[PDB]
């Protein structure tokens, strides 16, 4: 919801919509259905229209939406489908620069925004960002803010600066109260040990989940946040209760057991 | 005093009065008599109490008292026991979030406050926290940031991020012009090696000691920020002589790091 | 040229004159004759006469100047030197520590400031200074900033702060759309592995290239930050989008063309 852990948030292009139910069935705790960077322009429409007839013949689905942004002409067209379908929960918004950008998306949707750093102006922006009415988390664009910086993407050089962006964003989410943010997407789609250490990485830093763009990264996603079993024993008794092993049951400790439950997708 | 390097600074609860001889004697460069987080909320009445027995009791004793955060009840009571003892030469302010925070505490008690930074916040604000009237100099909450933060503490991923919590700790003491600050407390007793690889990281990126948790830990920390003896022999030359400003105060650096303050 | 990558730039004291050909021979993208700390205090005013005879003598020479800090009673005696030479074709601005003294460095000289943030002051007051008018590119004074924020230098606790401090420059140089910077002076002169892995580690987090003291780190750089056959491939195709060009034309300038 508004405030677990999404452990994993799989993009789909709206120019697939064969793929969008196999997004669905991936496991992946949100699909994040692309009008943006995966679709050429000369297909947004045809795009658009697809995502529409998908969310009319499957009302009980539940997606995000990548919007384009507002220097695109479609931007008005892409909140106004995400104002008016029930099946969308919220929209990630890219290349964040302002507040102004955030709060134009949430409420003309009337949806949850999750925006997504994509470059310097954004993160030295995150503040306001991070601090505008309807922001539900926060997630950013590693190759995009790679590319606006000159990196050297997938460079230890490269991830140390990478690590500022994400510093800003665990800061400035425990700032402004939201919920668990999201690391960005590993790329390499057939690395699944790279994949790993990305997670065990995100994990370590307080990161929910990942961004994810094929399937098969699901898997290894959600293997790598889960809670070992001992951990969740602990954790399910606590939830239900006091003392439990020792220590009282009081914030700290539910949101501890609770944070181990959404971990383990046992949220909610 | 307001100005040198501070080696360690060892927390006795208060519940416990009679530790603090122990700690007193264990040649930390300062003993903290701490009435928050070793504290039970029920014992804290009665713990401020057994300080202020010790103080009357021990009028030679000089201590810092880590008060209760600013929004705890017992901030007002805790204030006023710093501000009525002269034995309390200063207090540490827990959870520090606003330069306002600091002014409050730096007026009411008339004492110098150590703002330990150990949360979100108070990272956020750092700035005017340095730079409030009343500061001594800061210090780093390292477990309870991570908590703040969610962090897997002792991970590579989290030794990271303290990594800029650290940074913001180190910039703002200089420009706030503070005296060295402290890096937080080493929790494994049993693992010397832990301990002294700490310290040194923490020596290494200016930090001038650490705040710790037993007396056992005092030997360790001193010998690892310990200069070699040719820093030493150099250091005892160009303090004889007080060579510019910044090369006098690192002579004086040196020979505080050696306990020759 | 006043946006293009420079991969090297080769300080030369003033104190030896007789240096300043060799360097400008080296390869070395930029010669830095320097007035400030590699000439004691009693030998700048003949130092700074060495320089002036030499711009004098050699007018094809292309040369910045690292002057005096604002603080010095000399900084006014190297700005006029900078001002009234044709060869100086811009400056290094040591401990700079507001948009003030980079302004004053860039009216009074006439010529483009190259900032060295060398203190915590600097860092703090880094978007200020990147933004101020006449600034052509950062670089940063490692050795000095160790000693300003008392770090045990070429430790790895050391290194992580000066990782922070990096950072500050890099991020401005994107926010006030500054030419790629230079990172600090690599000191080990004899040790050719430590160097390359030192310009790897820059180039990967977005500098240019790297102040260098001694004419024997020119050929480690320039090497070290020559591209792929790849990359140069694509580099000079797309030369015969906007950011795209940007990337390309860096490529190309990573490679001496």
């Given at each position: ?62 997606v ?11 931007h008005?067209?892409?909140?106004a ?61 590693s ?27 665990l800061?400035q ?96």
């Amino acid at each position: 919801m508004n405030r677990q852990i999404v452990r994993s948030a799989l993009f789909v292009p709206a120019t697939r919509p064969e793929r969008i139910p196999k997004a669905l069935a991936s496991g992946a705790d949100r699909v994040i259905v692309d009008l943006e960077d995966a679709v050429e322009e000369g297909l947004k429409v045809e795009a658009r229209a697809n995502l529409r007839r998908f969310l009319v013949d499957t009302p009980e689905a539940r997606v995000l939406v990548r919007i384009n942004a507002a220097e695109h002409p479609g931007h008005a067209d892409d909140l106004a489908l995400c104002r008016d379908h029930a099946g969308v929960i919220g929209l990630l918004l890219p290349k964040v620069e302002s507040a102004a950008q955030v709060r134009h998306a949430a409420v003309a949707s009337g949806k949850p925004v999750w925006p997504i750093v994509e470059s310097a102006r954004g993160l030295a922006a995150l503040g306001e960002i991070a601090a505008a009415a309807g922001v539900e988390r926060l997630s950013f664009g590693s190759l995009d803010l790679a590319l606006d910086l000159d990196l050297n993407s997938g460079s230890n050089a490269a991830e140390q600066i990478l690590g500022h962006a994400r510093y800003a964003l665990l800061l400035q989410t425990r700032l402004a109260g939201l919920a668990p943010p999201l690391d960005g997407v590993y790329p390499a789609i057939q690395n699944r040990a790279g994949l790993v250490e990305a997670v065990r990485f995100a994990r370590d830093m307080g990161f929910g989940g990942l961004l994810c763009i094929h399937p098969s990264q699901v898997e290894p996603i959600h293997q790598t946040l889960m809670p070992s079993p001992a951990e969740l024993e602990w954790a399910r008794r606590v939830a239900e209760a006091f003392v439990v092993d020792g220590e009282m049951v009081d914030a700290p400790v539910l949101g501890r057991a609770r944070r181990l439950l959404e971990r383990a997708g046992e949220g909610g």
